[PDB]
């Protein structure tokens, strides 16, 4: 199903076509409100002057049973400020972008982290960037550190002299917990 259709290498960089390097990345974490890492890309990917400036959301997880939510505006959300937006990877509540060599490649987050609580329904809607909001819940114990990325690119969005930015999500997970008190 759409959960797992990994057959494309899709070699790409973090900055993509933008020439901005990691020294000038606008690195600010997802908001923390009642155990919810949210970094909504609303109004942060619109065409604007002095760009494209790469915007990176860093989610550092060190607690069990963590909920992570990411929002990207859809096409036509506001008049002529979100056209030609692209979402990478196309299946990104489950398939995630990982780093081998010096490239970003798609992989299944279930394989990287066991016990991922994928919610197929979020707010009675589908869980994908096709809705614009992605939702999943992390397990309470993680054996080893895992890093994966999500991409919300607005470089192709322009309005005369204005151009859109590029949105990146970096989720950084450290080991925590020992075991679950229960059955298997």
């Amino acid at each position, epitope marked *: 199903d759409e959960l797992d259709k990994i057959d494309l290498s899709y070699e790409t960089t973090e900055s993509g076509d933008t020439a901005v390097s990691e020294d000038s990345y606008d690195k600010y*974490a997802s908001n923390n409100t009642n155990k919810e890492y*949210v970094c909504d890309f609303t*109004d942060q990917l619109k065409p604007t002057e002095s760009g494209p400036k790469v915007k990176k959301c860093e989610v550092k997880v060190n607690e069990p049973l963590i909920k992570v939510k990411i929002i990207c505006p859809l096409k036509g959300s506001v008049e002529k400020l979100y056209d030609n937006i692209e979402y990478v990877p196309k299946k990104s509540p489950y398939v995630v972008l990982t780093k081998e060599e010096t490239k970003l490649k798609e992989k299944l987050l279930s394989k990287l982290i066991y016990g991922l609580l994928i919610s197929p329904t979020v707010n009675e809607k589908e869980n994908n960037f096709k809705e614009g909001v992605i939702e999943f819940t992390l397990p309470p114990v993680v054996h080893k550190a895992t890093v994966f990325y999500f991409i919300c690119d607005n470089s192709k969005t322009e309005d005369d002299n204005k151009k859109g930015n590029r949105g990146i999500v970096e989720v950084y997970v450290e080991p925590y917990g020992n075991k679950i008190n229960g059955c298997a």
Partner: antibody, heavy 124, light 109 residues
Framework: EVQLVENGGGLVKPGGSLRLSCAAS????????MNWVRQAPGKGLEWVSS????????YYSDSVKGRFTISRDNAKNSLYLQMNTLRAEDTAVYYC?????????????????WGQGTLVTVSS | EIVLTQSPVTLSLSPGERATLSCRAS??????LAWYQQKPGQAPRLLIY???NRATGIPARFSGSGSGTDFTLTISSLEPEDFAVYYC??????????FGQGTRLEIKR
């Protein structure tokens, strides 16, 4: 209740460095963001720099990109900005404002408490 | 970067009138506007955070409005102590955090 006091100013050498410090009393600076804003005489307010997650993330304005450095110490509960080499056309009074954790939202009671401000007079 | 314009520059109204201040977002701000009150001899004071929510301890006569753009700050009855300078700020496209130019209120004697 809550007070924010800044120190450092007076006569400033045009073509030299200077360090300003901010001290917070009556409140423990943790899990919150801090910002620097300046206001030149006869001109409106302008953002300078801000810091997040204690010292993990730091942000600067385009005019002060690289030339200014921001730092925060949790043990001393103080906010420091450093004008590294020299800047002379930034003559203004600098304010500090408590704010929520910086992020891709920035919503909340930004600037709930403000510092009285220090006049940075970079002139001969 | 998005530039915020506050218009008109100077307002002359008599005490007791309902004062309306107009703020225009150049492109758009996703309900991230804030209102501040300042005087020459003191630091600025937060009146309205978010689009229309009132801050803690602010008198009830201060009220905000707006939906993503064209945010107006409406004071139901302008008291003589309310004559001050007011600024606007947006927190949707940052850095930088762009402030407003400011507007003056004077007593129309």
């Amino acid at each position: 209740e809550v007070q924010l006091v800044e120190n450092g100013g007076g006569l400033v050498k045009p073509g030299g460095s200077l360090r300003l410090s901010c001290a917070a009393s009556g409140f423990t600076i943790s899990s919150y963001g801090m910002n620097w804003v300046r206001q030149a005489p006869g001109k409106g307010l302008e953002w300078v720099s801000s810091i997040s997650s204690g010292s993990t993330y730091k942000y600067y304005s385009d005019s002060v990109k690289g030339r200014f450095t921001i730092s925060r110490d949790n043990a001393k509960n103080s906010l420091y900005l450093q004008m590294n080499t020299l800047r002379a056309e930034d003559t203004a009074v600098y304010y500090c404002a408590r704010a929520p954790e910086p992020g891709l939202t920035w919503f909340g009671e930004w600037g709930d408490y403000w510092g009285q401000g220090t006049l940075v007079t970079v002139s001969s | 970067e998005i530039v915020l314009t506050q218009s008109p520059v100077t307002l002359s109204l008599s005490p007791g009138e309902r004062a309306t201040l107009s703020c225009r977002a150049s492109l758009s701000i996703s309900s991230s506007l804030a209102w501040y009150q300042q005087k020459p001899g003191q630091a600025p004071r937060l009146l309205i955070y978010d689009a229309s929510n009132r801050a803690t301890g602010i008198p009830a006569r201060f009220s905000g409005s707006g939906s993503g753009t064209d945010f107006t700050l409406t004071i139901s009855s302008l008291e003589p102590e309310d004559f001050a300078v007011y600024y606007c700020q947006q927190r949707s496209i940052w850095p930088p955090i762009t402030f407003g130019q400011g507007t003056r209120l004077e007593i129309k004697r």
